[PDB]
Amino acid sequence: MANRMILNETAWFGRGAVGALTDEVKRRGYQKALIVTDKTLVQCGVVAKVTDKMDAAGLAWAIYDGVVPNPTITVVKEGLGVFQNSGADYLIAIGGGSPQDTCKAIGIISNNPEFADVRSLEGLSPTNKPSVPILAIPTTAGTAAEVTINYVITDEEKRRKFVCVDPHDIPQVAFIDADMMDGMPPALKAATGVDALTHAIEGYITRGAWALTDALHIKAIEIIAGALRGSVAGDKDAGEEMALGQYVAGMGFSNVGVGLVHGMAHPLGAFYNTPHGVANAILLPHVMRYNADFTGEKYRDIARVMGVKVEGMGLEEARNAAVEAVFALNRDVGIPPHLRDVGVRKEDIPALAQAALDDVCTGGNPREATLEDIVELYHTAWTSHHH
Amino acid sequence: MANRMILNETAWFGRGAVGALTDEVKRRGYQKALIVTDKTLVQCGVVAKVTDKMDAAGLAWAIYDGVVPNPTITVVKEGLGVFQNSGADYLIAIGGGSPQDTCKAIGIISNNPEFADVRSLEGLSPTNKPSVPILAIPTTAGTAAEVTINYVITDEEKRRKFVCVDPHDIPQVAFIDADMMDGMPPALKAATGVDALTHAIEGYITRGAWALTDALHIKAIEIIAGALRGSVAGDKDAGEEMALGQYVAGMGFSNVGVGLVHGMAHPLGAFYNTPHGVANAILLPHVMRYNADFTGEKYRDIARVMGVKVEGMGLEEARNAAVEAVFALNRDVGIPPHLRDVGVRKEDIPALAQAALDDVCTGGNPREATLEDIVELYHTAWTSHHH
């Protein structure tokens, strides 16, 4: 059981980090970018922040702005057409998950043309050539698509999504620039922030957790717990910290499994289209409580970096302190306290529990959960038991 | 001031991790390896551990075993000749710093032939093509050459070393396998271990330190402090932990500066050819004491991961506890307590101090040191003041 880590070979961090793109492109000798993005980011002038710098530095670019939410086989083929017809030799992905995923597909098919039908990339793609180089510029503080080897494409003909898993698709450079993100409403910054915290905590305690993912996850938890209140209140430095925290959490959670929070949040998506972030946030502290005795010393670390002094406490008191710290953050940033507050129905719990039990990613949970354990966990998260 | 991180895109960790090489090569589609190594590793059967696996998996390889300590322009040209004449399309670097550095030079010149004279690579190499892909297998627990963008070549004609700095030279995969290292004497495991601890502590507190290098450095300190006693005593699991700790320390310290320990150890190399590791180890706690008031909360973290309970202490007591923990580890693993125990002469301190002051890397030290500060620090490290 050797451990593998896959990361972006190069990453730039800070407000104004996108400024590093022109010097990277020059040193890399690339002739011409295809910018892959959507109409919205062009219309709002976000793409122009990049093209203005490239024009000033004398760097050639073309654009494909046809990306839509749930990118399709058509969008991939369309983008690959513009790549081929524009004299481009590298990709700049400007946007959230959809542009990032569309770039991976375009870049893979360009160097692996036997996959031109796109649907043949599903599962562990048998590619033998790296993607065309991708320079990734995420514009949402909620995406880490640019540090994962996964991408999701919609097959319109067959009426389904398909997941592609391929180390060859990893972007060569990530630019993590809070200036390119700015402008979520407080409520979504809250859900997004605790969504990242959930991935970092689940990754910290997943069965396969090891030294390198532990190193990154505990830093992400420290950053997110330190910054999320300030970020929700619109603090500029807090926003920059949250961009870093989301990426660092991304580095860890892209390389190890998850557990029952993901397992239990995913069916709530399938049933009520509850925001993945809000469902995750509500469940997190209840699942942390469930898992506590199977986490060794790790909740001491979580308690410490969330600002609680626990070195004088016994291990179980320290574990209780970590759980209470997460309840406190959820309250402070306006997460609904219970699943019924976001429209979950008591009568669906047996069905939801079965879905969570059969979810592949539930196997990463450090404590074994039976159907009945998961039923009881939904109920504890569903309503207050103060009456 | 955006921060850059450069890392190996892929790394494999654990005893038997070199087993992952054959599946990596197959998925990457590469036709044929040039193995770059020295005669010693061939003679002792270390290279055969790799070629035996490649032969069983049906993977083609050639060998260049002409690497010597302080690799020369001649060794680079010789290796490039074998690369060209063997039908190789990728590199496997088997060995310590010398084979790793020779590979970077060969791989860069192969894809950047305008640098065929080798000496034209000195400084920030103006390469526009990535190196031929390098799969790095370090065989010494003391090297992190495979995660740095630096390499050093000896110019025999001009009677000098030259340093090449080039993001294009970064290996694509590192295999960190304690089985490929096994067999240092205790005394050198001790010097090597505290050498890694020194890089991690200096990197943790250097002026340019930031969230991602902090995340990796504090994990390396935890791993090394936890494992070094067991490793020196020949514990097998401790040896595996030390291989991981050295690499993780490598990830951090390759991306940020150092300080006065490096600044003061380097002239001791130039004057007495004192092992870089032993000089670093002796100086570390004295420099930590000097720096303490310019390190914020960080020595609390060092104290904690080295096994000291300091949450009840004031910050300055916690800082004293970190320093005492490092003195304790040095004693426990047999580091000489004072510089005069390794032949440093009192009369050389003014000259050594001047060299340290003018060393470029001394600028990373979080506390300003004048000539007189550095003179006094050498004296405090030079002899016991208990008599």
Curated annotation (Swiss-Prot), chains A, B:
Pfam families: ADH_Fe_C (PF25137), Fe-ADH (PF00465). Its cofactor is Fe cation. Pathway: Carbohydrate degradation; L-fucose degradation. NAD(+) binds at residues 38, 70, 97-98, 139-143, 150, 161, 180-184. One of its GO terms (biological process) is fucose catabolic process. It catalyses: (R)-propane-1,2-diol + NAD(+) = (R)-lactaldehyde + NADH + H(+); (S)-propane-1,2-diol + NAD(+) = (S)-lactaldehyde + NADH + H(+). One of its GO terms (molecular function) is metal ion binding. Its EC number is 1.1.1.77. Homodimer. This is Lactaldehyde reductase. The lineage of its organism: Bacteria, Pseudomonadati, Pseudomonadota, Gammaproteobacteria, Enterobacterales.
